[PDB]
Amino acid sequence: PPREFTQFRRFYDRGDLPISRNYGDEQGPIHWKVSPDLLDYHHYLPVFFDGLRETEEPYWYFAYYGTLDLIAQGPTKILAVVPQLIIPLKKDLNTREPEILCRCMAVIQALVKADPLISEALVPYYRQILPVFNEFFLDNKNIGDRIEYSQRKHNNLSDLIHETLEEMEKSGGPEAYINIKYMIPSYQSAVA
Amino acid sequence: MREVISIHVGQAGVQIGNGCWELYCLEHGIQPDGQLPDAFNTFFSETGAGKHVPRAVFVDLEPTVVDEVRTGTYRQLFHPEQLISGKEDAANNYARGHYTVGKEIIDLTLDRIRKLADQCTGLQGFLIFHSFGGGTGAGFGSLLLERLSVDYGKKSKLEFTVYPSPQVSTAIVEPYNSILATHSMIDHSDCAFMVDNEALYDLCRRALDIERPTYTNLNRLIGQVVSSLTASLRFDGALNVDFTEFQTNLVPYARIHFPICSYAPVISAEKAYHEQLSVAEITNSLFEPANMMVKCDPRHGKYMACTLLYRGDVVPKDVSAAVATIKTKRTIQFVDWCPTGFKMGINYQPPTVVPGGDLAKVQRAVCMLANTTAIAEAWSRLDHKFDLMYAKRAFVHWYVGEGMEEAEFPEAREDLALLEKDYDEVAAES
Amino acid sequence: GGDDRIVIWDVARRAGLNGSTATIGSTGGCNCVGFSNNDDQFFVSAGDTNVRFWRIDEERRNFTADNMKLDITKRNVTALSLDANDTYVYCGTTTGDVLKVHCEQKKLITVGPRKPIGEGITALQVTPWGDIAVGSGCGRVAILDAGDLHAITGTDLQGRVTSVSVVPRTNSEILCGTSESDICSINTDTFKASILSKGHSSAISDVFFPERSSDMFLTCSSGGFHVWNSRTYQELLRVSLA
Amino acid sequence: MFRDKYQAGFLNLFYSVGSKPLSIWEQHVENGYIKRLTDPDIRSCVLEIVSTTVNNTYITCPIDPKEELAIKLPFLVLVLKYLKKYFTFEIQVLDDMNMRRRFRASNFQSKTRVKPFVCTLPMRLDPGWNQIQFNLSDFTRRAYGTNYIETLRVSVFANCRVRRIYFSDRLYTEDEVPPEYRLI
Amino acid sequence: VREIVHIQAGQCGNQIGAKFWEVISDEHGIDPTGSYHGDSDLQLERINVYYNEATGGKYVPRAILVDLEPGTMDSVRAGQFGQLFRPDNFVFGQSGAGNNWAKGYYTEGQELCESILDVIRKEAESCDCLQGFQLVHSLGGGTGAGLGTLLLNKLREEYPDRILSTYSIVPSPKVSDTVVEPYNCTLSVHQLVESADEVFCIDNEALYDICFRTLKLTTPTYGDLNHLVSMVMSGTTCALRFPGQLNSDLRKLAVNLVPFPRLHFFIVGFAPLTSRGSQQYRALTVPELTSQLFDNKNMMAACDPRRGVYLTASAHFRGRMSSKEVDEQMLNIQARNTSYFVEWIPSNVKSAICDIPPRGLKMAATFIGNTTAFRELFTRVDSQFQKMYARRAFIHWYVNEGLETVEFDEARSNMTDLIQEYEMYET
Ligand SMILES: Nc1nc2c(ncn2[C@@H]2O[C@H](COP(=O)(O)OP(=O)(O)OP(=O)(O)O)[C@@H](O)[C@H]2O)c(=O)[nH]1
Ligand SMILES: Nc1nc2c(ncn2[C@@H]2O[C@H](COP(=O)(O)OP(=O)(O)O)[C@@H](O)[C@H]2O)c(=O)[nH]1
Ligand SMILES: [Mg+2]
């Protein structure tokens, strides 16, 4: 599977906002040209989701942190765009590189926390998403009694799977667990 | 890695840029086509294969100067979007290049530089070049600095300008353009260096064995200082000095942010054969009022800060020995509230020679930056010349019809009076 | 010499030439120097964080010096050897890797082996078959490919290896030396070590014959005692308590 | 091409005044002519395109048949003088769905069928200089439904006098505009 | 039974730590790729202190490298022991500082924190006995100083009992490399005083001075200075790994040397040091070690103890020596210089011996002392800071970060209080 061409690069070359990285202010990693509240959510956010697949700067830095800021500031409006995010999200997971999936899981964890209704709307989309997780589930390494460094890269992909799956299980509701079983045989419920 | 973006505004700045990038590529081993026969990320960008592109943007309102670069040997290295050429010039009028003509191209320039800054993740400062007497260099540069201040905020904006010579002049309207540019520059510029062509002419004639130099020799001398100044961030050294470290050494006060420069040893390719050119010899030669390229005697004023950079075989001892030796000079005065007042940086990479150049095969060299009250000597010269123009309103009609309100001239005069008055209190001792 | 000076002598005239200083300044002392394979006027001297190239001009009876480009791989240097051609030079380091430097462009191009050898390289010589042989203070003699300096084979001996020599245009045997006063030869085919003559590592100050038989004599020395055979000059016992 | 070139305010594509107005433009002439002259109604230069067969006399941009334009602005404003004859022009645009789309208007047209490849629009003018404005984003979403994507090719046919073809980022009414980018 | 996790911020600090791992691996006999090929069985007695074993016979060191721009990490990977470090051990930011102390701490520090803490975290529950981390950083810069002070607070919060042993390089007061430095050092001192259990001060001016008094290196480089710092670090942590006859650890040294919680800044020194050619003439003995250790030309700190008085002192020895000879020296040099010992804190000197000396240097010693002379150091930076602060031009650089102007004064007030505390304690 070649690198399917990312729309975010085509939106960024002419119109995208997050270029601003300049501060004389008490602000975070990225800045916006305009306040995100005025922006629409059908055009910007799906493009941002597609940008996590970028591998070289400045595209991926803006796309990753832009997605985080948009999901944090505007959690009410994202419910409408939830169906449109499945396609670009499914593009990112199929890359299977041990770096993109870390970003995707961070976004997903930041996504389910926004609204229990959102996670209930993601139950039909589990089948479209989980097969990547169902592959990488058991990639941990045995070291015995001595030390793990990987977590400062935050790249121990298995541990990200466990917490993230626990997050959909809590917010998924009544029918999230049975769907997880249909995708993940080795999973066992953490409901209580 | 860590990046610096350069802009070359005006006829003077573009020619200065050509000499600098010629020196960089020779110093870096990069061919004019961008290929090779490290710290290249600081000044160049890699586009795959084996091609590199400088992080430079050339701005001028006349196409002839830019077209020379577009048709030169180095035309392949630069990117077409980097070179920006205007349609009609500012005609040595600050008003024409700031309000009427500058505003047509100001926003076109900003996008191209801002797009380039996205690629520079480790960017920690811009280099900006001016000519005070020029209309485009002053009129457009002042507006561009104002836009850059709000856009980037707390990013370093280093400037390197050509202050008018005390006696040698090229434009009659020079005093008007210089004062207006400084009034805008005094608030937005993080730090700005000054050089005058008259002292450069004297130094390149006395030290270098050239009977009749041109602007090319002067640009080569300027480029050596810039290359030595930026060599700290590119190559390993026994002491590394950063851009913010060049800033706060020299400018303990906001409005007193003006340093002066001098370089040594500037010796011809045949007279260097007869001397050692050790660290002690070059360290003493810097303080000589003949070597420094701003015609204001420091023996009339005082020293307020000094910074040294060593490139070559230089060593921790004889730096420390020379600094102690220099401190014993009673012809040199320091204020008591500046007891240390020095810095040195030590870099291992020797200075690079230039084919067809005017320098000698030196093994060690030193570049010096200092702040002094002596700059007030030239500021009164500019003020008096401006007063002669403005007493009889000899050139007001050109500027007023081209856009500013007349009330801005006394505003710039008052700002100059406060700035000179600020330097005077700093000169005093309590 | 030990005063950081290099002096060139003329064999035909039995007379010397101008001396010079091996160092330039912020380098340190000099440790080794060698000649090129195909140029009488070209020779390379080396020191800690300092590799220099030299060419001799026969008109003024002097020689110029050239320095290496500023690579950040700061190491001390013990020994050097040039390749079969003048294009490459190889340098050993105190810390265990061999540096490969291009003579034409004066730059380091690779560092090897990827798994270095203990306590640096104490002996180096390019084999006649275009390959690199090294010696180490740990006691291991290894061969590193001339291409990218990846280890192909290696054997172990006692003591700190101090000398490695190969007969020119020969692929059968390699001679090795030891700080234990051991003289050993390594067969290149089966890659096995053989010992020819042992010795004492320091001052010997006592000798004794057992009265029952005179074919053995014992000796004591600083570092241990030995048992030797008089009929055929070989040892049979070594006991050392440091 | 023009893709990353900075595009704000106005970006013009044709102007009758200059040493080579039809420099980036292409000419194909049958049973007619393309001429440039000074028009008394405005006391200024203008390009004149007249032919018996309007379908076989046109100008197009860019010159290269394989290449496409990359103008970002969504509004295209046309200034032309109506010669009381048959007139037509066409535009090629792209949409979200990645179908190449072509719009060709005409004055002798009858209906406005929008069959997939090429939309046709009947139009009527006022005898004299006109200021037709085309909102590409509004038109594309109104007819085909998908959003607007950057313009590929523009073609203008015979029987008209044209002196202004430029793009605007938004809909500008009169006098919020440089003094040259309007009618005398 | 004593495992230490080593943390390196700083362009300076990362280079120093890398040379330290060079020294340790040569001492232990470790291949720069981690495979054991040494010669002493005593090297594996307590190798677990500094190393991990990966399945495959490879040893990985307990090393954390902290930076904000990838340039230094790229240099470290180009280093000899770059493969020794586990590839995940390195982290680097994506927005540089340029020695801006406020920028690194406030904007970059918060983002960096959530990542950096968790090797400090997961080393703690898996380093086999945590009784202290170790941090090396620079005070004049912005990245190491600001981030190191911030992480020192989080280290104290998450790990209160574990000893936060810090080694810092003081701004050179005649000339240092950076000049945002007085602002940076002032703000870092307030953070360092309250949290860090032990702080050790090193000046580059003294290192160059020592090189030309003793080493006679006509032309030294950074490699020598960091090598000497590595020697001090090797001497400090040697007692934990190797036998001896009388040994003191970090907590013992804190008990033995620190009389009061805020009087814990210490000077460091190493002996013997000799020029490369004159070492043959010298007969290295215990009295030669004692004279070298206490001689002012060997102190690696820009503070003459003769201008002050001593509070507490410590001496450590490497190799096999007679304890009677050591304690014979410790009495007679304690009596010789009674003008330098405080009357009401006797027993200032402490003694220790470790069995295994480093390679080639048959007999070795490391000295750590406490003297009131520290007051000169804070006075110099305060004097430089005063007129710099008197015209607030530079704080607006730090204010734009989000740092309040009043933040500079509380650090200055704490600095003056720390100076006053050392002044009363002299009498
Ligand atoms: N050292 C040096 N100074 C130069 C050079 N070219 C121009 N200058 C100085 O620049 C001053 C005038 O500025 P210019 O850049 O030439 O004029 P300008 O900025 O283009 O102004 P306009 O032409 O009206 O747009 C003169 O006083 C010269 O002393 C040069 O190549 N080297
Ligand atoms: N002693 C020593 N100091 C160094 C070395 N490399 C850099 N430095 C110092 O590091 C300081 C600058 O550090 P900086 O770039 O701000 O990074 P930081 O240490 O994280 O703050 C300067 O004062 C240098 O003198 C080295 O090899 N040895
Ligand atoms: Mg001009």
Q: How far is the CA of A70 from the centre of ligand 3 (A)?
A: 46
Backbone angles phi, psi at E265, to 5 degrees: -70, 130
CB contact under 8 A, E219 and C27: yes
Q: How far apart are the first and last CA of chain D?
A: 32
As a whole number of angstroms, the distance between CA C120 and CA C137 comes to: 7
Q: Looking up tokens 């006075």, which residue turns up? A: E379
| Two structure tokens written together for E78 | 């180009």
Beta bridge partners of B347: B311
Residue B61 Cβ inside 6 Å of ligand 1? The answer reads yes
E39 Cβ contact list (under 8 Å, min separation 6):
C138, E29
With an 8 Å Cβ cutoff, is A26 touching chain E? yes
User: How far does the CA of residue B87 sit from the closest CA of chain D (Å)?
Assistant: 14
Q: How many CB atoms lie within 10 A of CB B268?
A: 14
Secondary structure (H, E, C), chain E: CCEEEEEECCHHHHHHHHHHHHHHHHHHCECCCCEECCCCHHHHCCHHHCEEEECCCEEEECEEEECCCHHHHHHHHCCHHHCCCCHHHEECCCCCCCCCHHHHHHHHHHHHHHHHHHHHHHHHCCCCCEEEEEEEEECCCCHHHHHHHHHHHHHHHHCCCCEEEEEEECCCCCCCCCCCHHHHHHHHHHHHHHHCCEEEEECHHHHHHHHHHHHCCCCCCHHHHHHHHHHHHHHHHHHHHCCEEECCCHHHHHHHHCCECCECEEEEEEECCCCCCCCCCCCCCHHHHHHHHHCHHHCCCCCCHHHCCEEEEEEEEECCCCHHHHHHHHHHHHHHCHHHECCCCCCCCCCCEECCCCCCCCCEEEEEEEEHHHHHHHHHHHHHHHHHHHCHHHHHHHHCCCCCCHHHHHHHHHHHHHHHHHHHCCC
D abuts E (3+ Cβ pairs < 8 Å): no
Question: Quick check: D54 and D88 in contact, CB under 8 A?
Answer: yes
d(CA B419, CA E392): 17
B9 lines ligand 1 (CB under 6 A): no
**DSSP string across A15-31:** T-STT---BSSS--S--
CB contact under 8 A, A148 and E126: yes
Helix ranges (DSSP H) in D30-181: 136-143
The angle formed by the CA atoms of residues A11, A17 and A23, to the nearest 5 degrees, is 145
Tell me the C-alpha distance between B367 and B239, whole Å.
Answer: 14
User: Do D61 and D26 meet the contact criterion of CB atoms below 8 Å apart?
Assistant: yes
**Ligand number with the minimum distance to the CA of B134:** 1
User: Are the C-beta atoms of residues D21 and D14 closer than 8 Å to each other?
Assistant: yes
Q: Which residue of C has its CA nearest to E19?
A: C74
Contacts of A14 in chain B (CB under 8 A): none
Nearest in space to B366 (alpha carbons), one of B284, B244, B297, B251: B284
**Contacts by residues D104-107 (CB-CB < 8 Å, ≥ 24 positions apart):** none
Tell me the sheet residues that pair with D149.
D94
The conformational region for residue C64 under phi > 0 = left, psi -120 to 50 = alpha, else beta, is beta
Reading the block at residue B155, the tokens are 């990013």
Residues of chain E positioned with their CB less than 8 A from the CB of B1: 69-71, 74
Ligand closest to CA B15: 1
C54-78 burial: b if 16+ Cβ within 10 Å, else e: bebeeeeeebeeeebeebeeebbbb
Asked if B154 reaches chain E (Cβ–Cβ under 8 Å), the answer is yes
Distance CA B221, CA B281 (A): 20
CB atoms within 10 A of CB D62: 19
Residue (of A69, D154, E394) closest to B244 by Cα position: E394
Q: Are A126 and A180 in contact (CB under 8 A)?
A: yes
SS3 A155: coil
Give the nearest chain E residue to B187 (CA atoms): E393
Distance from C-alpha of C6 to C-alpha of C65, rounded to nearest angstrom: 12
- What are the residues whose beta carbons fall under 8 Å from the beta carbon of E284, sequence distance 6 or more? E272, E362, E363
Nearest CA to E104 out of E127, E64, E54, E138 is that of E138
Gap from A22 CA to chain B (nearest CA, Å): 5
Q: How far apart are CA E65 and CA B272, in angstroms?
A: 46
Calpha distance C161→C184 (Å, rounded): 10
Q: Which of E13, E260, E46, E279 is closest to E146 using CA atoms?
A: E13
The three-point CA angle B141-B143-B145 to 5° equals: 65
Residues lining ligand 2, Cβ inside 6 A: B 239-240; E 9-13, 15, 99, 138, 140-145, 169, 176-178, 204, 222, 225-226
Name the residue type at position A93: L
Question: Which of E88, E123, E400 is opposite residue A153, by nearest beta carbon?
Answer: E88
Let me know: does C34 contact C43? Beta carbons within 8 Å.
yes
- Of C16, C132, E141, nearest to B245 by C-alpha is E141
* CA separation, residue C136 to residues C31, C126, C141, D14, E359 (Å): 17, 15, 7, 78, 16
In one-letter notation, the amino acid at residue E212 is: F
Ligand number nearest CA of B131 is 1
Taking the centre of ligand 3 as the mean of its atom positions, its distance from the CA of residue B137, in whole angstroms, is 7
Q: How far apart are CA E266 and CA E253, in angstroms?
A: 11
Alpha helix segments (H runs only) across B207-251: 215-234, 243-250
Torsion of CA E139, E140, E142, E145, to 10 degrees: 0
Resolution, Å (one decimal): 4.2
The token duo for E263 is 């009087």
Task: Give the distance from CA B260 to its chain's centroid.
Answer: 10
Q: What sign results for the dihedral spanned by CA atoms B8, B10, B13, B18?
A: positive
CB contact under 8 A, B124 and E175: no
Atom of ligand 2 nearest to the CA of E146: 21
Closest CA to E100 of A24, B402, C83: A24
Q: How far is CA B116 from CA B4, B44, B82, B177, D3, in A?
A: 11, 11, 9, 30, 16
The sign one gets for the Cα dihedral C109, C113, C119, C120 is: negative
Give me the residue from E78, E83, E218 closest to C72, CB to CB. Answer: E78
> Strand, coil or helix: what is C206?
strand
By CB atoms closer than 10 A (0-12, 13-18, 19+), residue A191 is exposed
Residue written as token pair 């027993």: E347
Asked if D178 reaches chain B (Cβ–Cβ under 8 Å), the answer is: no
Contacts of E45 (CB under 8 A, 6+ apart): E241, E242, E243
A8: distance to nearest CA of chain D, Å? Answer: 14
Ligand 2 center to residue E12 CA distance, Å?
Answer: 4
Instruction: Check whether the bond before B37 is cis (ω within 30° of 0).
Output: no
Do E35 and E21 meet the contact criterion of CB atoms below 8 Å apart? no
Extract long-range pairs of A178-185: CB within 8 Å, 24+ residues apart. Answer: A179/A123, A179/A126, A179/A127, A180/A126, A180/A130, A182/A127, A183/A126, A183/A127, A183/A130, A183/A131, A183/A133, A183/A134, A184/A130, A184/A133, A184/A134, A184/A137
Q: From chain D, pick out residues whose CB is under 8 angstroms from the CB of A13.
A: 3-4
Distance of CA B130 from the midpoint of ligand 1 (Å): 8
CA angle B1, E137, E47 (to 5 degrees): 105
Nearest to C242 by CA among E30, E40, E364: E40
- B174 belongs to the catalytic site: no
Q: Contact B15/B215 with Cβ under 8 angstroms?
A: yes
Give me the DSSP letters along B268-312: -TTGGGG----HHHHHHHHTSTTTSSS---TTTS-EEEEEEEEES
Residue C135 and residue C164 in contact, taking contact as beta carbons nearer than 8 Å: yes
Contact of E411 with E381, CB cutoff 8 Å: no
Q: d(Cα E109, Cα E143) in Å, to the nearest integer?
A: 9
Nearest Cα to E63, choosing from E160, E118, E133?
E133
Task: Count CB atoms within 10 A of the CB of residue E333.
Answer: 17
In this complex, does chain E touch chain C, defined as having at least 3 beta-carbon pairs under 8 Å apart? yes
Helix (H), strand (E) at residue B408: helix B408-427
Catalytic residue, chosen from B68, B88, B245, B411, is B245
End-to-end Cα separation, chain E, in angstroms: 41
CB count, 10 Å around CB of B299? 11
Structure tokens at B303: 């020293």
Quick check: A151 contacting E, CB < 8 Å? yes
- Locate B134 and state its tokens: 């020029």
* Contact: A153, E91; criterion CB under 8 Å: yes
Using alpha carbons only, give the angle B128, B134, B137 rounded to the nearest 5 degrees.
25
Tell me how far apart the alpha carbons of residues C238 and E225 are, in angstroms, rounded to a whole number: 43
- For chain D, the residue count is 184
How far does the CA of residue C55 sit from the closest CA of chain E (Å)? 25
d(CA D51, CA D29): 8
B15 lines ligand 1 (CB under 6 A): yes
For the purposes of burial, counting CB atoms within 10 Å of the CB of D45, is it exposed (0-12), middle (13-18) or buried (19 or more)?
middle
Beta strand C77-82 with C107-112: parallel, antiparallel or unpaired? unpaired
Residues in A closer than 8 angstroms to D141, CB to CB, are none
User: From which experimental method does this structure derive?
Assistant: cryo-EM
Look up residue C18 and give its two tokens: 């101008």
Backbone region of residue E402 per phi and psi (left: phi > 0; alpha: psi in -120 to 50; beta: other values): left
Burial of D184 (0-12, 13-18, 19+ CB in 10 A): exposed
3-state SS, one letter per residue, for E233-272: HHHHHHHHHCCEEECCCHHHHHHHHCCECCECEEEEEEEC
Distance, CA E13 to ligand 2 centroid (Å)?
7
> With a CB-CB cutoff of 8 Å, which residues 177-236 of chain C face chain B?
none
- For residue A181, CA distances in Å to A117, A161, A187, B386 come to 21, 15, 7, 85
Residue E21, number of CB atoms within 10 A of its CB: 23
Cβ partners under 8 Å of residue C146, min gap 6: C83, C88, C126, C130, C131, C132
Q: Which ligand is nearest to the CA of B10?
A: 1
The 3-class secondary structure across E25-36, one letter per residue, is: HHHHCECCCCEE
Strands E353-354 and C183-187: unpaired
**How far is the C-alpha of C207 from the C-alpha of C221, rounded, in Å?**
9
